[PDB]
Design a protein that fits this description.
Chain C: Keywords: Calcium, Hydrolase, Metal-binding. The structure is a homotetramer. By secondary structure, the first copy, chain A, is of the alpha/beta class. Chain A has eleven helices and eleven strands. Chain A has one domain. Helix content of chain A is about 35%, strand content about 20%. Bound molecules: N-(4-fluorophenyl)-4,5-dihydro-1H-imidazol-2-amine (3 copies) and calcium ion (4 copies).
């Protein structure tokens, strides 16, 4: 399985990537970066942090766009920390080493990969700016991609950054609409914020993000600590669940519903995902196998 | 004057290109195509027709985006004909020969042009889709460009009414917004739909699009037939006016007002623009030297 | 005058409907729907919207065919907005209410009406798929219709207005050929797309599609707003004119020619029509009384 | 097996209906007629003739359309005789009694049967007008039909009424095209004129259309006479092969290919059936079991 990752690497993105890194059936062919949770510069460094701590700084990292498509920067709390990665200390991980960053823009580099790589998959964990620009430029190339796995939206209209809108799709609703109207929704699987709260864990009862012993455990514990707090003591593994579904396929999904999705692009409900039952729409995952989810997360943290 | 042209080669674009060809002080460094008046494939063919009729194939032609960013296509075959250039017969003009199309995407080619041509100017004759994408991927590059001349938008007219039929910004209001908020409006000059509406010619009184005796005159007359008839016998020379202004500068412009410019992206007036008197705004041309404009139109149709 | 209307209720269609509703000598006995400007479902909604805005829900609405006869689905357009009616908000019109739709297929209902209602006329505002199938299924019935008023076709040659603005006949050339070769052309009057551009109006000069004060004016102004932005600031009355001719007859017509019409069903000109002077042919209108046209449009908005 | 039959009451049609009547597992739920070989008027008569000769006029008969969709009706060089059924004499058969015919139009009847009869199959023996219109009016209804069995086309490109076209699909090529593009070709089985010429028989060398003893053999022998003379002493059993395949199915198919078919709708090859290899196209039966075929053709003729 050939996988591309577009990310605004904050805390839960980083774990998503660890999930992809750990499974040997997954070849990460590139990582593209975009400014969501934090600035593009911070994202790029945080992807570097994650690869280093895992010990595979082999994957090319590409910088993408610098702002949403047309939408402004708005006003956020630093939910993922000032650095976008929980404000961790690099000395606690040995990652005060130079950062890698390819030359090509991520849009150009994505288009090239969708042309020159067969059965390519993309896992989107971020506002969809990079992807939407690639579909605007070379839709024929991007359409060669085999499947889209996207963390975004909330099909029950219950958002997080907004009462109505999930963060990725409120941050660049135009970009989301572009994807939902240019890449076949039938070949699109969605892990929504509705899913991430439904499959959430009380962090007092589950300890799988709360270990020391090795660097992977330390990284996961320290990065996840402020957002677990922000989410009210719950673990809401939005991006990891999307990585989970990407890597493990039908085994990852307990229940899904084919849903045609479309974006609200004005009014107080800007960024809300409208849902309509349609057998050629998106596979909107409704329930994951939570035990297989915690299993693979523990296994990637295993000493062995 | 080094000049890039971005066009959706329709009928008045073609005349506008002819204006740039006729003036020996302009070097056209490239022409990017976007699907506006007609599909991107037709625009590319029509730019080719225009260059062959003139006799200069030394100008690279690049293909751009396949659609507007978010909105639907809005092609106008009832106004510019099915092929977007008035359905002329290539066998009548000797333009039934292979078409020229560079391999690089217009967006990438524009960025490289902005990064490698000193004193590059851009004349934009179409929905700003291509330009918006270039500003998102490489704003440092596009910002190197000395000046934007843009045909688009519709501001307050004579009597505080804005006239009805603006096309370019209406057709991709998100692209126009991106250009207006990313490229400095002070280095932007506007040839607006208001201008064109108030510099229209009764075709019965003016014959300069109804001459004969050489190829260029055949080309102008045949290509303007459908739009003149569709305009009730009236010549509304939007893109020629813009080319007039970018080419002949201060001799083209009688009156102008500096105005800050804004797209409405939400609610009932989506696709209209906002205009506030502002000294760092766009130089929005209010009146032209129409006598000189007809002169330059007649001259490029001369037997020399 | 008893009248059946066939529509892909989009913007001009709705105003054309309103022309018929506004004249008390016209009895609309039924409106059939076909998906052209927009999907069938959107057309049904939009006919309902137009009836509600006027105040006469007493007219049965029938659903018809979904696609062209032979031509493959080339994807629903959006010249008339996403919903086919300029994307208007029903909360501003009080039309967020259940929709009416009869159970009979439009093809069967029209055949029934043609069999039972004396001196039935038809106003055809859309691709002719419904009429063609009714003609093909029950010619002896449809041939009873007193007269055919058809919006469609364009002149191709002997003019400067592109034939490529034409939609209804291009959208289903086979249906148009069936009507033209089965229903008598002498009993047919044509309001062409050429007519709609020739008798068009500069909206920067005419404000008759830009009033308020009441519901009809708001409907007319807001529906036509997007299509005037398309069409470059111009009002191109394609369907209203057809309704104008159907309802006001010789008063509506300035000039007209009898032309035998046929479709080009193959080659680069597929969808175009051949016209040949012939006095057993279609009454093809070349010029309308525009001053009376505007008067008629302002009155129904009064 | 529940079967609807569409035909024009022709020579080889009648034998095919006899094949279905004579099988005790076939429930003929209706017979629709269409003006193919002869007038709809004669087709209705001939269908009545066939059912009386067999002895079960318990099956409803529906009149359908009177002409092709677009094409004119053709000059018939009497392939099937002036009356369509070989110009046979009613007194030689006792079929000079009142006809039966339902009131409902065949289009509406077929649609109602598709909407209300479980596992409905259709045997199309005729120009496809009725089916095309049913498809155009109520696709949701007609798609419920379990399978289509159709006599039409010639993947050879070698027709009969035309060098390039088989009679049924030449006579209404639009109708044929509508069926092939609207009803799943995968759920369609074609018995082409190629097939009928492949599995032909010299009448000089074969007897089974030349036997006497009852009314049935009198019927087949006397109806088939003028037309096997027409084919020059050979028996090409186009519609009987179609009934054979439909009633027997895989018990009579020796060899078949999956071919996507489409119509030529213009030029000299008007009515030609184009064929591409396509695993989800029509099963185009290339050869049947002539032995099993002539067997059941005898079983139905042995004295009842
Ligand atoms: F507006 C927001 C509110 C909460 C969160 N929390 C969260 N996102 C991923 C994992 N946990 C994000 C945005
Ligand atoms: F391709 C086309 C684009 C626009 C229009 N305009 C229009 N159709 C009915 C009333 N006004 C027609 C064809
Ligand atoms: F144009 C034609 C040429 C030959 C035939 N012969 C035949 N059709 C069914 C059984 N035998 C029919 C039409
Ligand atoms: Ca993320
Ligand atoms: Ca232009
Ligand atoms: Ca219409
Ligand atoms: Ca037959």
């Amino acid at each position: 399985m050939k996988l591309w990752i577009d990310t605004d690497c904050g805390i839960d993105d980083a774990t998503a990537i660890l999930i992809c890194l750990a499974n040997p059936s997954i070849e990460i062919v590139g990582i593209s970066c975009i400014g969501g949770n934090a600035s593009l510069q911070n994202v790029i460094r945080n992807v570097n942090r994650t690869l280093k701590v895992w010990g595979k700084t082999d994957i090319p990292i590409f910088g993408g766009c610098q702002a949403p498509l047309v939408q402004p920067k708005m006003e956020i709390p630093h939910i993922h920390g000032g650095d976008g990665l929980g404000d961790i200390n690099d000395n606690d991980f040995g990652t005060n080493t130079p950062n890698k960053l390819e030359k090509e823009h991520a849009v150009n580099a994505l288009i090239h990969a969708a042309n020159t790589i067969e059965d390519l998959n993309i896992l989107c964990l971020a506002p969809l700016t990079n992807i939407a620009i690639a579909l605007s430029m070379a839709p024929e190339a991007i359409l060669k991609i085999k499947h889209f796995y996207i963390m975004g939206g909330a099909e029950n209209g219950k958002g997080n950054i907004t009462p109505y809108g999930e963060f990725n799709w409120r941050a660049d609703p135009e970009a989301a609409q572009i994807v939902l109207q240019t890449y076949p929704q039938y070949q699109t699987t969605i892990a929504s914020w509705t899913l991430a709260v439904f499959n959430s864990f009380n962090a007092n009862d589950y300890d799988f993000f709360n270990l020391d012993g090795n660097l992977v455990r330390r990284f996961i514990r320290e990065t996840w600590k402020p957002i677990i707090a922000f989410d009210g003591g719950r673990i809401c593994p939005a991006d990891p669940l999307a990585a989970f579904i990407a890597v493990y396929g039908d085994r990852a999904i307990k229940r899904a519903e084919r849903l045609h999705l479309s974006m609200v692009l004005e009014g107080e409900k800007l960024g809300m995902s409208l849902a309509e039952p349609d057998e050629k729409g998106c596979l909107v995952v409704k329930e994951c196998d939570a035990e297989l989810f915690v299993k693979i997360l523990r296994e990637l943290q295993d000493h062995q």
